[PDB]
User: Which sequence fits this backbone?
């Protein structure tokens, strides 16, 4: 007898461009839970047990899991949370002041204190997220150094493709020890000699795993409610090694930066993202291939839980496919269990019946084959998408919603453009570090809403004389445009404005 996998699917792990396509893939999704709260926690020399909460104005934007033990969520106001926790530590985010080109933390201030001098008025202030962008960047530098392929899914989430690391570790690591008596080089000498030997057809089946390797330990919580054998094939051997490696990367994030992370480990991104949100914080959820259906049917997940099926598209599928309200995943598998063609024939008929409503439908009748395959694999937990890089920036905006008189004249507009130009510059610096190239916006757009909520807009070029000398250039143009729009206003209902925004587009990366 022999393994269910081939050499092709194992060698593929060494290819950064196609390792994800292999059923032996080892993907990881790492999430820094309540990231903003973790950042403020560390900044104030606090511990994970101190119940910090990141406040914006009157709302909570991040809840440390110490504060969640008191039932605090993002739906509560600070006053509601104070009544839930009397030792709460609300920390307000950094903030610009109207007319200043720098942001500043006002620790000890906020709408929850009584002293009127310790207030952070919303009327003449704008939030700054630079502290979080800067800390997130530090995490990526740690990720990108331990993994040759990293996707920044968001400011607090990343995917890793541990393919190359797992493969090289499987075939060449001579230092790893299963126990005090057994090293990897000895337990896997059979497949290593077979690989160096080269006497295999790439479509030949791998040799059976040796009994020696079942001593290999998973680092983390292996999701296994049915008590299946842990190491039953090479997919589990790869996944086990990846759990060890991934624990080290997550411990680097905590030893260098102090941030905790929940993690999901499997053979596909969709499953990895579900696993990381299954147990948190400071957790690591492993989903073997032989436990994929157990995981998708554990009760937490429905068809709408997948990355792309949460919106209108998902809800239309529930009606077209006549899915139950619970266990819709299991229903998809069993209603079309043989092949995606069955589901494609079902979709083709449905869109071809009477009362199809093809004019408003979100189901493209020409790509029913691509869709049927997507659902067929997601429901079986084998829909592997590649780790894509963050698309290059096309547009940035900084705006402020103005309630009251905080923008009654031209001078008040310029004061806000000074804030907008500083945030856009900060956000361009963070990009120049990610792209490792210079970033130059070539056109600027100002738009504003009058007291009657009518819109005035004007765009144009920004003449960077030298190179990357923004935050003065584009404030010139910003002030020129807001002046023109004043003259267009003139004897019209204009001030006090209700909204003001600056948008930069047409970037040149060099
Ligand atoms: Mg998240
Ligand atoms: Mg000023």
Assistant:
């Amino acid at each position: 007898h022999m393994s269910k996998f081939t050499w092709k699917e194992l060698i593929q792990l060494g290819s950064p461009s196609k390792a994800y396509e292999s059923s032996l893939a080892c993907i990881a999704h790492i999430d820094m839970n309540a990231f903003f709260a973790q950042v403020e926690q560390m900044r104030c020399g606090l511990s994970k047990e101190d119940p910090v909460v990141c406040v914006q104005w009157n709302s909570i934007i991040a809840v440390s899991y110490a504060a969640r033990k008191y039932g605090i969520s993002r739906m509560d106001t600070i006053q509601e949370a104070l009544k839930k926790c009397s030792n709460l530590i609300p920390i307000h985010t950094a903030v610009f002041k109207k007319g200043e080109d720098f942001w500043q933390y006002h620790d000890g201030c906020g709408s929850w204190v009584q002293d009127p001098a310790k207030q952070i008025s919303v009327e003449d202030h704008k939030v700054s997220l630079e502290p979080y962008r800067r800390e997130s960047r530090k995490a990526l530098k740690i990720f990108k150094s331990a993994c040759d392929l990293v996707e920044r899914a968001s400011i607090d989430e990343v995917f890793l493709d541990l393919g190359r690391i797992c493969f090289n570790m499987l075939m060449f690591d001579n230092e790893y020890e299963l126990t005090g008596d057994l090293k990897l080089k000895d337990a896997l000498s059979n497949i290593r000699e077979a690989f160096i030997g080269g006497n295999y057809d790439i479509n030949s089946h791998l040799p059976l795993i040796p009994e020696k390797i079942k001593s290999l330990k998973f680092e983390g919580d292996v999701f296994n409610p049915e008590g299946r054998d842990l190491i039953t094939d090479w997919d589990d051997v790869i996944l086990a090694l990846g759990s060890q490696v991934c624990k080290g990367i997550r411990d680097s994030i905590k030893d260098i930066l102090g941030y905790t992370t929940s993690c999901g480990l499997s053979s596909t991104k969709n499953v990895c993202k579900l696993a990381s949100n299954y147990k948190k914080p400071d957790a690591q959820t492993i989903v073997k291939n032989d436990c994929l259906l157990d995981f998708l049917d554990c009760g937490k997940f429905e068809i709408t839980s997948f990355w792309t099926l949460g919106g209108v598209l998902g809800k239309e599928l529930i009606d077209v496919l006549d899915l139950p309200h619970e266990n819709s995943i299991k229903h998809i598998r069993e209603t079309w269990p043989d092949n995606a063609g069955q589901l494609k024939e079902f979709l083709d008929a449905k869109v071809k019946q009477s009362d199809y409503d093809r004019s408003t439908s979100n189901i493209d009748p020409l790509k029913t084959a691509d869709l049927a395959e997507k659902l067929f694999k997601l429901s079986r937990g084998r829909y592997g998408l590649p780790l894509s890089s963050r698309p290059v920036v096309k547009s940035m905006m900084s705006n402020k919603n103005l309630r009251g008189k905080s923008c009654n004249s031209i001078v008040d507009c310029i004061s806000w453009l000074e804030v907008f130009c500083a945030e856009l510059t900060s956000r361009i610096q963070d990009l120049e570090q990610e792209y490792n190239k210079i970033v130059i916006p070539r056109t600027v757009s100002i738009s504003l809403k009058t007291k009657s909520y009518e819109v005035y807009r004007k765009s144009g070029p920004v003449a960077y004389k030298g190179i990357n000398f923004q935050s003065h250039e584009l404030l010139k143009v910003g002030i020129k445009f807001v002046t023109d729009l004043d003259i267009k206003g003139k004897n019209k209902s204009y001030y006090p404005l209700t909204k003001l925004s600056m948008t930069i587009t047409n970037f040149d990366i060099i």
